[PDB]
Design a protein around this ligand. Structure first.
Ligand code: MG
Ligand code: ZN
Lengths: 653, 1320
DNA sequence: GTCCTATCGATCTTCGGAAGAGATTCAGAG
DNA sequence: CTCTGAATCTCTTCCCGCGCGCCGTAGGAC
């Protein structure tokens, strides 16, 4: 190809074939002109050494070059590896009908939607837009509709909002480690230029919102839409593929709001009255007559689905708080209130959400998750949950704890100053005195944070769980648990040298206060190690996943039951003393290999190829079973695949 | 106390406490004094071009038997100055001219010349020059050479565990690294046999070198090993005991004599026994024959009588051998002492590997191991071996390498030759063997005493050497064969190889970086980067934790925070604020001398290996105003260890609390509080802020802005003191005062400011005045702001009023919520200037034209072109507008159209034309401009001298010799024709009218030369006829998706542009401008951002009291009282300031700049205590909790509990969204395989890359995948059938088989590999 | 100045990758 | 006299996206 003016792009192969053909022209000449052996052995060497270049330049002694020692890319350099066809153009390739933008958070989306800019939708869906303007007969054909789109005329949006009206679009970040990293959403149009993503789903992508771009793809055919809607739509993927654990796990602000809504404060406005239901609980809150975390009694009703699966509705007085009454209004009618009657936090609400999925199923769960999100945002707003430096709490015992520990370290030093302790022992004991100070500072600081709240119970003071701003965030599990708050206001503690060996004199300061220059300079030996690790690791992790999919990709589940009776045995992992995992982690949802007996003898408990779903694993936990034999894909005697029963539960379903 | 006239306009209230004894060095002396060190000639020939010339000249051929020799060099002034050069697009360079003298000798005679011909300065090349901003201009583009940091030349000893063999033991290695030439490695084999190699070639037995130097083995053994002797007298074979050779080891055998036995069999030996051994004088002793039967002999033993061998040096003895050789009369038999701990036998072991006999057989082995396939040959071998280590053409420890070598061998002196010598290698071997004998230490590799900085003035001296090295090879041959009769030096050399060498360097080297001219900080922190990469360095892909990590010698030399996280952490570092390059290139940094017990205010720079010899107190350490330490014991660092030591034990002290950081981090306030992750991301995000439209000042800073904005050279700085004569936002012109004038000059310094222009990153850079007409200015005052500055403080961003709280989730996770009030104010709008160019050529079908007569297009488009064929200035343009109506013969409308998507106002055009080619009225329009701009500024001197000279007529008329019957109405040289007599005054008149004519003739050549600069065309590339460049300015606003960041490494997209009524507002009804999320502060431990907010809030409060005191018409004496009460606030803060001396005028002029918040300094590790922020907030009428109750503008409800409100500083980053939003329906495809193009600069499709395909396969989704990688992508049929089915709305595909896979088949079948598709 | 033909067939490709595995080279001996 | 141990050499691998920026055969002979 020509480039900038009358110059051909140096198009490597044509320099290699040029080498060959020149040499061959000479060799035909010198053969027919009958040169002596030494001359033809010259040209014959130079020809063999040139065809060497053309095939796989650089397996020779040295690669040949035509610039500042750039080796020319030969054929075999075009086939292989990271810039060659197999990886670069075949296995994955660039695609039309795609676009990208910076993502930004859209709180108002229902979980299945994402907003995408009108400019992109109009430049992406063009073929479908022509397929409406001809169908309106409003444009004569492509030749006019093209112009009618270019002019961006007033009709086109009402057409676009009919084209798109339910065409799923696929959003994926990159890298995309796992299936949850491409998902489909129904688009809704936006005026701006960012892609408005749903808040809960950002966690799945590991999409942070700090300027993290995301690509979008339109699926074109009917089949690509039916696959997108049935499989990849975000509503169908509330669980992880890898472990039976939600991926909708609540966003930090949502859980902050729900924690704040459900606390009890022992003094409050409107405390102690009795109400006929959530609705007048809300009227009581919204008019400002009762505080949200005030204690109350309410009439409640709750629903249970019986042994058949049909609802029994029940009603009672409940003793609770205004905000637990309001929150009960969001829960779908089939869960027990005992799941809400407690000050909620990130673990407690994940199990809340999980139990919704356990009891109702998917379709209520996605909507309940949406409502949780909206609720948490709204009460987190009213909560005004700011952060402020007067809210960093230093336990003044910290001053004494250092002033004590410093002298005891100097006792280890004075022995050393008398030769009375060894050079190893002096060090490895001093760092334990600093550990004994550090545990004490941390413990005093967590006690002080809980200690900061005490209030008059109409007469005489009494204590309660601390409304201290940073402590709400830790105690809720929103962000920054013990290891962070310890550094913010307790002490930063011991630090490590480049070779991992521990510093003899720790950072007894904390970030509420200043580090001096040395404490700061040593602090960076931590952090720069942790960044070097990130930037170094991100290669080897990827080369690991490549090697794995590129060995696993041959498997597909391909029979129902291979017909084995063989398998392997599961127990709690008992080691180092106590059990590091229970049986219910391992065995849940495999199929039994062999008939599982009652603990004891001759009474069978589970038939010999039964899926041990949850009601079976709770039953095993009712028994004194320790070892269970189950089928495993390593033992499944299907040729060229695996049988379904040997694989067992599909974790995402 | 005094402040300069640009300080005394916004005296930043300073909270610092430590008195800054050393004021920050000019932040680019790293670069400028490197290049000055290259460009200056220096008779002490090291450093500079002159050193390189003297590295090659004199130059000669033996067969020519004549020479040419360098005498001296001159460097002419650069053909175009920087401003004009940056327009015209060439490189700013200087012509290199060299006095070469060619000397012609004769045969037979003494060498006295037949002739010698000094060529009058042969032209040698064009070396670029550095601009005073420290940047090179290389093709109009402005480029910066980052300093390299790499392993200094020297000798280095090393060892490792597990990386080698892993059986618990460690292997030791020594290297000699020259500056130029071959590396030599010595290393032991595991079995302690010693080996050597050159340049990581094959392993050789190490004595092969000592052989090659023609030591015999007997001599080698006298170089390395201690003697033990046997004397065959008083009884057969007595033995020479040196007592100290037995200690700690077991006396496993009979040694005794004469009285008390020292130590009998089986017992250790100790001091008291050695003293008894000495007191008995054990000079000879009895030992059993097993002892002598252990020995290896030192020296050669032929039988003299037969003349024939019985034993040889390092041959091993036995009783029968000892008998026959002492029986042969060799009554002194001599051997070596080799205790396994202290005297291991490694060289004898090496002589058991050794295949060599003597010198020649080793040279044979050398030449065959090094040059396999060439013949060894006695006359030929040395022409390898000497050029490995002993010849200047190929081995060279520079003066730094020799110094480091000598220091490591513990030599007394460091003025030494650059080549090795026998004893220079032997000393390395001995030191390596001492290490293996356990009596020494290995060096830490990654220590800033072993790695040295190379900067531009050294990289370019090497590349210029590569030049002279290729001229060497040409000129030697041409001289050797030449007749010497007609040749003159300009025949002998030609510039082309030098120019190739240096131009490729500055143009394209891995270190000639294109400058990040993003904002004035990013200019500087780039000019002072330290890079480990590039030629002679390591590589970003090929290093690990050993070098990325920080090291204890970094303190004060390299900033630990400011490194570009990502694939090259710590392979790039930023040279710390105060640090400096030593003479040799090692990084050295200033410390205060602690003299006995007082901190003396004198600074000594310490290199990284001077530092370990002292104990140095941390910068915070207090003093008593005499200067004794206040503390009785104090924290110091010492040997990388840190601990507490006594008062008056300590020996040096840090110079400043800023010493540990770079400017990039030194600008963060309250850095004392931040996690070093978030310090790092802060100090990296500051260098990306784009200059906003109306930039001002950070309210909380560090007082480093007053230095970054000035030293970065981008504010225009007053070269000499004077008074402002005129200002108009394009020119500023200063009547310099006569106390700093040069006597013949007009005395007037213009400053033509640069206006709207593209930065290298497309942000605009318009300088604006800060002065007023008639205002006085002093040398070094800022006259004009740069981009991102105001009043000469750095000012990247805008001091936006932020409150920390959740808001319905719009600021979830990280996002920033923003009020419409900020965008309405044009707070963050920013101007992006693109350059588009239309080239035109003398193509093969014929020459192009620029015209409006374009074929196939009507006035519907052409309405914006003028009649010449270029767009009007001030045309506002959009996609597809024709900017330049180029056309090609045989007529084709190829014309410059504005690319898709972009839009803007055409702010300027430029036109460039070859020689011998016609202009047009847009070239004449530009000539009219530039001529007039030169002529005006010249006239404003000629006018000033004319006025002075006519005064110099008038005054000496009017004062005496008056002729003023009529005077001032007349032409003031027609004043000569008045009738004054031939007394001296008429001769003064005649002479000073001739001085007036010559004053006209003076400018009569100066303006001609200037107009000749403008009249000419330009040095176009071959093929082009002319080029025109057209600039589009876009005023981009701010919108969802744009990125903003704080200084603390907090960052977000802005997520919604909320209308004012929805912002929270306070109990006074002012809404907040931004709502940040709180949870990021504990979760990422960057709580310094809260104290910036509170101190920012107080900063607003003082302006709030001042603005009220200016709306109310308070008298200055009350106003001065409040301002003074603000500056004196706090503890014993460093600064003192007396508004009593500000003359009221300047008190109002000060107030008029505080009236939007008092600016504050919080120097990095020395900031305000909390108790001083509270104190300032109490001086304002503000709530000292810092928090305020807020209400929600959606309802007017109160928020529960107050929330933080205050003035953070926020930067718009250059990652703004419309520069990234992209989408493609269909368009281009690549040629080799039909997959879509990739880009925004091309209308590309996103890569559905490898990992996404596994992601689809992991759903069941097969049809989606089939589509994505065929129909949507590659199948040349199917995609056009798909498109039509979609416009038909059929929703069906025909999938085929991708053409990229057919490419593969042919690319395999283009090997002799028959791959084929198969049927069943 | 343009067109055609060839590369260090009279040097010196960078030491600062680790690894990890194979092909290919050598011990102590039956 | 070469057979299983081990020893030195080369070959091969090293995240995914993305955006800029520039830079892009020579020398000799007719
Ligand atoms: Mg991110
Ligand atoms: Zn099976």
């Amino acid at each position: 190809v020509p480039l900038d003016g009358g110059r051909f792009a140096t198009s490597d192969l044509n320099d290699l074939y040029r080498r060959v053909i020149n040499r061959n022209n000479r060799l035909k000449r010198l053969l027919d002109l009958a040169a002596p052996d030494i001359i033809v052995r010259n040209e014959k060497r130079m020809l063999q050494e040139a065809v060497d270049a053309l095939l796989d330049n650089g397996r020779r002694g040295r690669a040949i070059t035509g610039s500042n020692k750039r080796p020319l890319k030969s054929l075999a350099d075009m086939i292989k590896g990271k810039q060659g066809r197999f990886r670069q153009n075949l296995l994955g390739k660039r695609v039309d009908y795609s676009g990208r933008s910076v993502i930004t958070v859209g709180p108002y989306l229902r979980l299945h939607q994402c907003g995408l800019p009108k400019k992109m939708a109009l430049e992406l869906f063009k073929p479908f837009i022509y397929g409406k303007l001809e169908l309106r007969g409003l444009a004569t054909t492509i030749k006019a509709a093209k112009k009618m789109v270019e002019r961006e005329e007033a009709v086109v949006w009402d057409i676009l909002d009919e084209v798109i009206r339910e065409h799923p679009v696929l959003l994926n970040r990159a890298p995309t480690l796992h299936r949850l990293g491409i998902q489909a959403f129904e688009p809704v149009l936006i005026e701006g230029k960012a892609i408005q993503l749903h808040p809960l789903v950002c966690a799945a992508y590991n999409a942070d919102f700090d300027g993290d771009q995301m690509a979008v793809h339109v699926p074109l055919t009917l089949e690509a839409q039916l696959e997108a809607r049935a499989l990849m739509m975000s509503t169908n993927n509330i669980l992880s593929p890898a472990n039976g654990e939600p991926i909708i796990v609540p966003s930090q602000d949502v859980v902050l709001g729900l924690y704040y809504m459900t606390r009890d404060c022992v003094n409050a406005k409107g405390e102690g009255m009795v109400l006929t239901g959530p609705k007048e609980a809300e009227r009581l809150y919204r008019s400002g007559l009762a505080s949200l975390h005030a204690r109350v009694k309410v009439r409640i009703t709750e629903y249970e689905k019986d042994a058949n699966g049909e609802l029994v509705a029940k009603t009672s007085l409940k003793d609770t708080t205004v905000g637990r009454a309001i929150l009960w209004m969001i829960v779908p009618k089939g869960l027990p209130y005992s799941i809400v009657n407690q000050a909620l936090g990130k673990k407690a609400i994940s199990k809340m959400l999980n139990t919704c999925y356990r009891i109702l199923g998917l379709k209520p769960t996605v909507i309940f998750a949406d409502q949780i999100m909206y609720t948490g945002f709204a009460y987190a707003a009213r909560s005004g949950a700011s952060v402020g430096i007067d809210d960093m709490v230093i336990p003044e015992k910290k001053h004494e704890i250092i002033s004590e520990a410093e002298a005891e370290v100097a006792e280890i030093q004075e022995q050393f100053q008398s030769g009375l302790v060894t050079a190893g022992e002096r060090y490895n004991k001093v760092i334990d005195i600093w550990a004994a100070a550090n545990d004490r500072v941390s413990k005093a600081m967590m006690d002080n944070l809980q200690t900061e709240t005490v209030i008059n119970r109409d007469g005489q003071e009494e204590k309660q769980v601390s409304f201290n701003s940073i402590y709400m965030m830790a105690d809720s599990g929103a962000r920054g648990s013990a290891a962070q708050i310890r550094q913010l206001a307790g002490m930063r503690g011991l630090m490590a040298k480049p070779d991992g060996s521990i510093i003899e004199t720790p950072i007894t300061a904390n970030f509420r206060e200043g580090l001096n220059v040395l404490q700061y300079f040593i602090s960076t030996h931590g952090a720069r190690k942790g960044l070097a690790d990130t930037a170094l690791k991100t290669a080897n992790s990827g080369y690991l996943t490549r090697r794995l999919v590129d060995v696993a990709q041959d498997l597909v589940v391909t029979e129902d039951d291979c017909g084995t009776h063989e398998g392997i045995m599961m127990t709690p992992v008992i080691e180092g003393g106590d059990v590091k995992e229970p049986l219910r982690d391992r065995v849940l949802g495999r199929v039994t290999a062999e008939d599982v007996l009652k603990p004891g003898t001759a009474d069978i408990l589970v038939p010999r190829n039964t899926l041990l779903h949850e009601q079976w694993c709770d039953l095993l936990e009712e028994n004194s079973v320790d070892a269970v034999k189950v089928r495993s894909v390593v033992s499944c005697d299907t040729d060229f695949g695996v049988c379904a029963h040997c694989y067992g539960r599909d974790l995402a379903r | 106390m005094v402040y300069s006239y640009t300080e005394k306009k916004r005296i930043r209230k300073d909270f610092g406490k430590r008195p800054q004894v050393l004021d920050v060095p000019y932040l680019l002396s790293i670069q400028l004094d490197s290049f000055q060190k290259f460009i200056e000639q220096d008779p002490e020939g090291q450093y500079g071009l002159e050193a390189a010339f003297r590295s090659v000249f004199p130059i000669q051929s033996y067969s020519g038997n004549s020479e040419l020799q360098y005498v001296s060099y001159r460097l002419g002034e650069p053909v175009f100055d920087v401003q004009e050069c940056q327009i015209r697009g060439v490189t700013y360079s200087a012509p290199l001219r060299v006095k070469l003298r060619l000397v012609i000798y004769e045969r037979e005679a003494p060498e006295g010349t037949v002739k010698d011909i000094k060529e009058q300065e042969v032209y040698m090349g064009e070396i670029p020059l550095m601009t005073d901003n420290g940047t090179f201009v290389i093709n109009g583009t402005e480029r910066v050479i980052v300093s390299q940091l790499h392993r200094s030349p020297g000798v280095f000893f090393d060892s490792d565990k597990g990386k080698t063999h892993s059986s618990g033991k460690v292997l030791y290695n020594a290297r000699i690294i020259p500056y130029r030439g071959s590396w030599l490695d010595f290393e032991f084999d595991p079995k302690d046999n010693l080996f050597v190699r050159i340049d990581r070639r094959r392993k050789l037995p190490a004595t092969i070198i000592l052989r090659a130097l023609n030591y015999t083995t007997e001599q080698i053994l006298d170089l390395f090993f201690e003697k033990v002797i046997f004397e065959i007298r008083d009884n057969k074979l007595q033995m020479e005991l040196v007592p100290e050779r037995l200690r700690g080891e077991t006396a496993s055998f009979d040694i005794e004599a004469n009285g008390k036995v020292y130590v009998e069999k089986g017992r250790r030996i100790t001091a008291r026994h050695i003293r008894q051994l000495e007191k008995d004088d054990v000079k000879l002793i009895e030992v059993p024959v097993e002892y002598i039967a252990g020995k290896v002999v030192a020296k050669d033993y032929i039988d003299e009588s037969t003349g024939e061998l019985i034993c040889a040096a390092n041959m091993e003895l036995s009783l029968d051998l000892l008998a026959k050789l002492s029986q042969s009369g060799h009554k002194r038999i001599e051997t070596l002492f080799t205790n396994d701990l202290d005297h291991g036998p490694y060289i004898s072991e090496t002589l058991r590997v050794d295949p060599t006999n003597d010198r020649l057989s080793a040279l044979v082995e050398i030449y065959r191991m090094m040059r396999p396939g060439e013949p060894p040959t006695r006359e030929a071998a040395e022409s390898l071996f000497e050029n490995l280590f002993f010849s200047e053409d190929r081995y060279d420890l520079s003066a730094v390498g020799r110094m480091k070598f000598n220091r490591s061998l513990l030599r007394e002196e460091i003025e030494g030759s650059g080549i090795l010598s026998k004893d220079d290698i032997i000393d390395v071997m001995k030191k390596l063997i001492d290490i293996r004998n356990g009596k020494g230490e290995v060096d830490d590799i990654d220590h800033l005493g072993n790695r040295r900085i190379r900067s531009v003035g050294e990289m370019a001296e090497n590349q210029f050497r590569v030049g002279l090295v290729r001229v060497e090879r040409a000129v030697k041959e041409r001289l050797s064969l030449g007749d010497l009769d007609t040749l003159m030096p300009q025949d002998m050399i030609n510039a082309k190889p030098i120019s190739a060498a240096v131009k490729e360097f500055f143009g394209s080297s891995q270190l000639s970086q294109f400058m990040d001219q993003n904002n004035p900080l990013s200019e500087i922190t780039h000019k002072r980067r330290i890079s480990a990469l590039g030629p002679g360095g390591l590589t970003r892909e090929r290093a690990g934790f050993e070098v990325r990590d920080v090291h204890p010698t970094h303190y004060g030399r390299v900033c630990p925070i400011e490194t570009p996280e990502g694939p090259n952490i710590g392979l790039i570092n930023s040279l710390s604020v105060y640090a400096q390059t030593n003479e040799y290139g090692f990084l050295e940094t200033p410390y205060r001398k602690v003299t006995d017990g007082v901190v003396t205010d004198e600074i000594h720079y310490l290199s990284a290996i001077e530092e370990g010899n002292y104990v140095i107190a941390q910068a915070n350490s207090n003093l008593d105003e005499e200067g004794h330490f206040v503390e009785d014991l104090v924290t110091c660092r010492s040997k990388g260890e840190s601990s507490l030591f006594s008062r008056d034990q300590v020996d040096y002290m840090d110079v400043s609390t800023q010493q540990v950081v770079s400017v990039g981090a030194s600008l963060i306030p309250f850095l004392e509080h931040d996690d070093a992750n978030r310090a790092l991301m802060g100090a990296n995000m500051q260098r990306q802020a784009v200059p906003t439209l109306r930039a001002d000042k950070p309210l909380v800073g560090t007082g480093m802005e007053r230095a970054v904005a000035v030293d970065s050279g981008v504010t225009a700085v007053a070269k000499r003191g004077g008074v402002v004569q005129y200002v108009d936002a394009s020119r500023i012109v200063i009547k310099v005062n006569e106390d700093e004038m040069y006597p013949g000059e007009a005395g007037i310094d213009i400053y033509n400011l640069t206006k709207y222009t593209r930065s290298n990153q497309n942000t605009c850079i318009n300088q604006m005045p800060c002065v007023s007409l008639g205002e006085p200015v002093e040398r070094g005052d800022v006259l004009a702001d740069g981009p991102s500055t105001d009043l000469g403080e750095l000012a990247l961003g805008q001091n936006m009023r932020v409150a920390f709280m959740p808001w319905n989730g719009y600021n979830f996770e990280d996002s920033i919520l923003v009020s419409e009030r900020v965008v309405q104010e044009d707070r963050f709008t920013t101007i992006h200037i693109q350059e588009l160019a239309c080239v035109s050529r003398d193509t093969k079908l014929g020459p192009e034209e620029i015209t409006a007569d374009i074929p196939n297009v009507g006035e519907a488009a052409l309405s914006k072109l003028d009649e010449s064929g270029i767009v009007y200035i001030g045309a506002e343009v959009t996609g597809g507008d024709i900017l330049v109506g180029k056309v090609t013969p045989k007529v084709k409308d190829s014309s410059l159209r504005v690319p898709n998507g972009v839009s803007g106002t055409v702010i300027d055009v430029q036109v460039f034309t070859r020689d011998g080619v016609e202009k047009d009225k847009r070239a004449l329009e530009i000539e009219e401009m530039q001529l007039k701009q030169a002529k005006k500024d010249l006239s404003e001197e000629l006018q000033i001298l004319e006025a002075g000279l006519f005064s110099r007529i008038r005054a000496v008329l009017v004062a005496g010799g008056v002729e003023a019957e009529k005077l001032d109405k007349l032409p003031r040289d027609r004043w000569l024709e008045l009738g004054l007599t031939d007394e001296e005054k008429q001769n003064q008149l005649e002479q000073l009218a001739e001085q007036y004519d010559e004053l006209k003739h003076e400018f009569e050549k100066k303006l001609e030369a200037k107009r000749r600069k403008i009249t000419q065309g330009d040095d176009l590339a071959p093929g082009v006829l002319k080029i025109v460049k057209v600039y589009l300015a876009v005023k981009r606003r701010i919108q969802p998706g744009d990125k903003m960041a704080g200084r603390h490494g907090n960052k977000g997209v802005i997520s919604k542009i909320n209308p004012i009524e929805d912002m929270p507002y306070d109990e006074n009804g002012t809404p907040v401008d931004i709502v940040l999320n709180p949870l990021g502060v504990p979760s990422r431990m960057n709580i310094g951002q809260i104290l910036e907010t509170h101190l920012g809030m107080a900063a607003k409060g003082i302006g709030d009291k001042i603005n009220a005191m200016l709306k109310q018409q308070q008298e200055v004496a009350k106003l001065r009282e409040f301002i003074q009460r603000a500056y004196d606030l706090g503890a014993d803060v460093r600064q003192k300031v007396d508004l009593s001396t500000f003359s009221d005028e300047e008190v109002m002029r000060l107030a008029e700049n505080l009236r939007k918040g008092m600016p504050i300094a919080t120097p990095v590790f020395d900031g305000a205590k909390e108790a001083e922020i509270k104190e300032l907030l109490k001086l304002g009428d503000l709530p000292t909790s810092g928090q305020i109750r807020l209400y929600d503008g959606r309802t007017g409800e109160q928020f529960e509990r107050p929330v933080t409100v205050g003035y953070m500083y926020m930067l718009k980053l250059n990652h703004l969204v419309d520069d990234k939003m992209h989408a493609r329906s269909t368009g281009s495809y690549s040629l080799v395989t039909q997959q879509p193009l990739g880009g925004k600069a091309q209308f590309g499709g996103q890569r559905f890359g490898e990992m996404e395909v596994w992601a689809l396969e992991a759903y069941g989704a097969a049809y989606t995948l089939q589509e994505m990688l065929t129909v949507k992508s590659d199948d040349v049929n199917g995609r056009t059938k798909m498109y039509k089915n979609i416009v038909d709305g059929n929703h069906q595909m025909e999938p085929g088989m991708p053409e990229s896979f057919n490419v593969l088949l042919k690319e395999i079948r283009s090997l002799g590999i028959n791959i084929e598709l198969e049927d069943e």
